PDB file of C-alpha atoms in Angstrom:
ATOM      1  CA  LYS A  13       4.324  -2.531   3.575  1.00 58.42           C
ATOM      2  CA  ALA A  14       2.571  -5.697   2.406  1.00 58.12           C
ATOM      3  CA  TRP A  15      -0.222  -4.578   0.080  1.00 63.12           C
ATOM      4  CA  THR A  16      -2.707  -1.739  -0.399  1.00 65.33           C
ATOM      5  CA  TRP A  17      -4.017   0.078   2.673  1.00 64.70           C
ATOM      6  CA  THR A  18      -7.725   0.868   2.362  1.00 62.38           C
ATOM      7  CA  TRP A  19     -10.748   0.900   4.670  1.00 62.11           C
ATOM      8  CA  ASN A  20     -11.993  -2.611   5.445  1.00 61.65           C
ATOM      9  CA  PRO A  21     -15.636  -2.376   6.592  1.00 62.33           C
ATOM     10  CA  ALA A  22     -15.843  -6.168   6.410  1.00 61.44           C
ATOM     11  CA  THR A  23     -14.424  -6.339   9.935  1.00 63.62           C
ATOM     12  CA  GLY A  24     -14.244  -2.685  10.928  1.00 65.80           C
ATOM     13  CA  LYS A  25     -10.464  -2.330  10.920  1.00 64.83           C
ATOM     14  CA  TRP A  26      -8.254  -1.018   8.115  1.00 62.84           C
ATOM     15  CA  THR A  27      -6.817  -4.239   6.690  1.00 65.36           C
ATOM     16  CA  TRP A  28      -4.357  -4.735   3.833  1.00 67.12           C
ATOM     17  CA  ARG A  29      -5.746  -5.779   0.450  1.00 68.08           C
ATOM     18  CA  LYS A  30      -4.034  -7.872  -2.225  1.00 68.55           C
ATOM     19  CA  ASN A  31      -5.051  -8.341  -5.861  1.00 69.23           C
ATOM     20  CA  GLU A  32      -3.190 -11.597  -6.496  1.00 68.80           C
TER      21      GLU A  32
END
């Protein structure tokens, strides 16, 4: 419940994303 939850191809594992 930290930030957005989208696909993170950068590493290969769905990682949270923050826009701040």
